[PDB]
Design a protein around this ligand. Structure first.
Ligand code: NAP
Ligand code: NAP
Ligand code: NAP
Ligand code: NAP
Lengths: 334, 336, 335, 335
């Protein structure tokens, strides 16, 4: 058993906890740090507006929750430096607060006794950034200690980008992600540093910067400076699509583009990238464990320009990717 | 002109600003305090997801906005004791932050040079609480200085409860308000004191307590102890209905219940309480200026048990009620 | 196994299909009639915006779908007198089109070779109406051949009204159900015989008439004349709540009201009616198998006036009740 | 005054009715044909889930509605051959039913006494297709009698495309339109010829095809064969964006792309194409009169590849383009 702690028991933190329970046989969450009190925190674990009721018994007290009869230690420190992960023999900490995406801050978990930190977002000053299935072979068990699992969008874009770059060569490309609203958007028109994300999320198409097409550079260095993009946040609670338009010197058809993805989407890579010819809408990919679900029916080719669209559950799909990377960290030296 | 200040430039603050421009010819908002920086504040004033664009030009600088060419002083003081309303010759302050509903706290506005404060919600320790059209005749210009305009729901329930109580006598009633989600609720399942309001607001029916039915007693003491209720928050952005089920000893029919409202919903009171026989849905009462829009088509009677239903725009309707109350205050003496 | 046919492969028909696969050990759906072509019908079985993907393989051809290797004959006859259930040895037909709730139309299934018809809605001219767990004991296998499983709302209201009526006595009560939009409503403001249901469903609170409180009287004749109500359709895709306000001559408290349901919600009956003290919102009762989930936190009392509130998944909850009714029918004489 | 009839009093028809009242001083709608009784029709005119209440008073009788004192004759003829527009001295008919986009059906309005038919959609067999601001100067009052006002998407894309093609030259481009759901989509998972449009509209992102990028060729022949695209329908009731990604041989920057739109979007053409540096979301362009609202903050450039985004109210914005076209027709020869 490799012992895991979660810092930030929000959407991704709670997704991750459920993923551990459902898909892991060698990881165990033993400690959680979060701003919520234990009554709220256990309630939100038990009941989920997206995932439904947890399949296990949940109780709490002043210092813990207990899930399927396993006591889990719970803290409420604003500052990671006041945690003690060593006290519980925690090896890996999932940093999913959204406020410690700077590795120089997330480093504090390691001072506090953790061996590894995996940031559940694009980071700064990180040892390394990973999309599982794309660049995880490059993980250095000795020197990669505070790492990033990238964004939901990057985990969708990169697997497909890699396949098509390897096969046909991408010269330039621009991305639009049409993406479920997230918790940092406001419910009613209200204060936000981003004036568009200020705006009532459930009744607006909300453009917002993404970053997660340039972040492909960190994971596919071949594509540095060749990809850019942005998001339109729209009123669905989870489920997103990445629409990539790109040029290639290759001679391509709809058919050959699609066949390139079909032939890659196999074996273990095929757990990251799926290939579909089904008449998909967003609800069909909710709770899909892939990082990227390629939609062959949406491929277009105009000369040397190609549009391709891949789906992703930005919550569960990303989390499943984050867990694959967590499994890789645990299987190697700590 | 009576000059007005707004503390808390949120949904209700901004509705109130627009209501003054559209509906008043004797009030002017000359100063605003809020948490936002001027870029964000002017932006959220210019653009509204519910109300659409402001029909006036908006500009901003380091300590003001300019709206239709009128300069409005803007502050970002989290503590109202750090404001000065007398500096801008402001008589009345709307207290719409939602964090100063204790009148002892809201009194800071009086010490900062305002003559009157109107709290845009239920209050504690207040001089007086009003639903316009129901009990505004009791307003005492000398002694009611920090006052409450009640809640959106109380402004919908009280007009209707008064009419039916006066005509038939209400023994006991219980209310459900089916209510647009509001800013207190969470977009995604996340931290909240209320474990239900914690839950993703736009995909859930969310039960939550109000106090709006017990608060009717403040404006109609005859109904002390006779009403209670709760809310179900549902995925519409604004627009709400209050569904009241009560017992009467009177012999009543659907027709006599409806006739009672129709009779009453006239003149100045009719600006607060409307009577409708139209096939209404919530979008039909968005931007309606009444506190209470009685839906005759929904009334039911089973023996001595009556169900009546009244709609309200919890933003705009409540705001129009608050503006009526503000106009009253502004028409009577304003001394320190 | 008893062989079942479905007429009307819509929300309820497809829920029913999935419920049979998941919850039944003695029933098999062998034949479906619907307006859709096989491609469309198979697509909507496999993919569901509410229930997610079906966990079985789905294939189709010119006059069948095949689900987890089981061939299912498919028809598209507007008029059921043009069907033939006997050719598939179908005993029970679930009548879920929404358009044949008059038993005088629905009985065409019997003429077409079925032995029993269960209508997925309030009916007219029917042999009997049932809410499972409330009055199914009155089922007459000889004379009850074209029956109704009543409405989603009645299946929520009736169990709770029964318990509270039995204990305290209901003088009169009025109901509001705050209810998920349904397929009868328009997406955009458009033609409808009901000028409120005409209005854009996903952005409106929409009042609409339900006969579901008065229909409790079919199932609990003690309450005839004593109940009425209406619905407010609101923008969630499934999941609903029935809010009942009634007066009683008994002296009652929030605790005694809650205790009466908790007491009752225990056995077989407890599969129909649950008692919850949880902080429920609508998403928490989506895919719940109960007819009625009583929310003890929402009980209020003022003098002799009582308000109680119960949740239901108007799709799956109702469907599980219909399945319970079907199992009872399947367990007795099919002459 | 030039008198106008509307055939198809749906979303676009009723938007058009309101646009005339709000924005025209020289047109009057004097007759309407739809599928509805006058109570139903008057209700849906008076009350709108998107546009709010009509400001004018609305009465009806067996033969008509009266709006602000003006009697408007109403018909419910399925087949336009059975109308008589000449009896109402109607010169121009708006064909907004959606079912007569073949000009050889639409021309029945002319047999029925009208002089001009404007189809509120892509058409077939038409005399001409127009995006106001782009190609309306080619309108020929003698020979252009059954015409198309193109699609919502085409009225957004073509103005932006013309400016950038004129300045920099577009070699090829692919577009994605992120589009409010429309009446054709289903509220619950249900029958549709499009297996994705079958899927509950207000909880799904729904890919669907549009010919709107190819149809730019009818209005800008230079761009024939160069553009294609598709749509993602999303849960907002109105308001859309068109995202075009294109290659040019020109040397361009974000700044130079944006500068080109800004210098074009002035004068009369600027009532069709607006230039914005505001932090726009979809609700900010609801009831916006422009065909195309270019969002300078979303422009991206990677080498010789450009992404530009333009907003449109697919209801009101399109309708305002249609009214511009109608005003032009009304201003020139009517036989
Ligand atoms: N949601 C997605 O689709 C998605 C996908 C991929 C990656 N991510 C990334 O994952 C991260 C979390 O996002 P999310 O959607 O899960 O947001 P979230 O629900 O807001 O989760 C953040 C959680 O951290 C807690 N928290 C905040 N500051 C804390 C502190 N100093 N110490 C301890 N706990 C603290 C919050 O408690 P309170 O709620 O009480 O403040 C909350 O439970 C972000 O970096 C986000 O970009 C999100
Ligand atoms: N339907 C309704 O919305 C409704 C109806 C009737 C009554 N009310 C009541 O009206 C009040 C406001 O509600 P709302 O919906 O307008 O909420 P809101 O949108 O959150 O408005 C609150 C505003 O006050 C600001 N604020 C918070 N603390 C402040 C402080 N210490 N000093 C200055 N500004 C501060 C907020 O800025 P930040 O956002 O930056 O914090 C925001 O602009 C509440 O009491 C509410 O119950 C609301
Ligand atoms: N919450 C609920 O939805 C709910 C709950 C309880 C009971 N019910 C009741 O169950 C019934 C079905 O409602 P629903 O929501 O399932 O509606 P629905 O989704 O529209 O289902 C009706 C189905 O029947 C098909 N159909 C219509 N006319 C037909 C005909 N003449 N022959 C064969 N098939 C025909 C329809 O095909 P097309 O789509 O091609 O017309 C559709 O697949 C109604 O009586 C309703 O009141 C519904
Ligand atoms: N909505 C948009 O965003 C948009 C934008 C640009 C262009 N358009 C185009 O405008 C047209 C109308 O679309 P819409 O959204 O307004 O659709 P809609 O709401 O369905 O309007 C069509 C109207 O025509 C009626 N109708 C149907 N067949 C008729 C007939 N034979 N004779 C008379 N009335 C008839 C319909 O009644 P029933 O409903 O009872 O059949 C309805 O009132 C379509 O060609 C569409 O592509 C739509």
């Amino acid at each position: 058993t490799i012992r895991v702690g979660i810092n930030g028991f929000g959407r991704i933190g709670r997704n991750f906890f459920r993923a551990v329970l459902e898909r892991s046989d060698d990881l165990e969450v033993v400690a959680v740090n979060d701003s919520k009190d234990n009554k709220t925190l256990s309630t939100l674990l038990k009941f989920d507006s997206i995932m439904g009721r947890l399949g296990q018994e949940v109780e709490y007290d002043d210092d813990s929750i207990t899930v399927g009869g396993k006591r889990i230690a719970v803290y409420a420190e604003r500052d990671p430096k006041n945690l003690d992960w060593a006290a519980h023999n925690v090896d890996i900490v999932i940093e999913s607060t959204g406020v410690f995406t700077d590795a120089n801050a997330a480093k504090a978990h390691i001072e506090a006794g953790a061996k590894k930190v995996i940031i559940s977002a694009p980071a700064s000053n990180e040892d390394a950034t990973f999309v599982y299935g794309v660049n995880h072979e490059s993980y250095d068990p000795e020197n990669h200690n505070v790492i990033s699992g990238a964004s939901c969008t990057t985990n969708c874009l990169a697997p497909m980008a890699k396949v098509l770059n390897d096969k046909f060569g991408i010269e330039n490309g621009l991305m639009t992600t049409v993406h479920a609203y997230t918790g940092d958007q406001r419910l009613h028109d209200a204060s936000h540093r981003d004036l568009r994300r200020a705006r009532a999320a459930a009744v607006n198409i909300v453009p917002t910067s993404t970053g997660a097409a340039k972040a492909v550079a960190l994971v596919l260095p071949e594509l540095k400076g060749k990809l850019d993009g942005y998001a339109l946040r729209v009123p669905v609670i989870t489920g997103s699509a990445t629409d990539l338009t790109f040029n290639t010197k290759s001679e391509v058809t709809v058919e050959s583009i699609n066949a390139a993805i079909k032939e890659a989407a196999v074996g273990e890579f095929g757990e990251t990238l799926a290939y579909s010819e089904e008449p998909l809408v967003s609800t069909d990919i909710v709770h899909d464990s892939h990082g990227s679900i390629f939609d062959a029916g949406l491929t277009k080719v105009s000369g040397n320009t190609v549009k391709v669209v891949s789906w992703y559950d930005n919550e569960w799909g990303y989390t499943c990717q984050l867990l694959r990377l967590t499994e890789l960290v645990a299987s190697k030296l700590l």
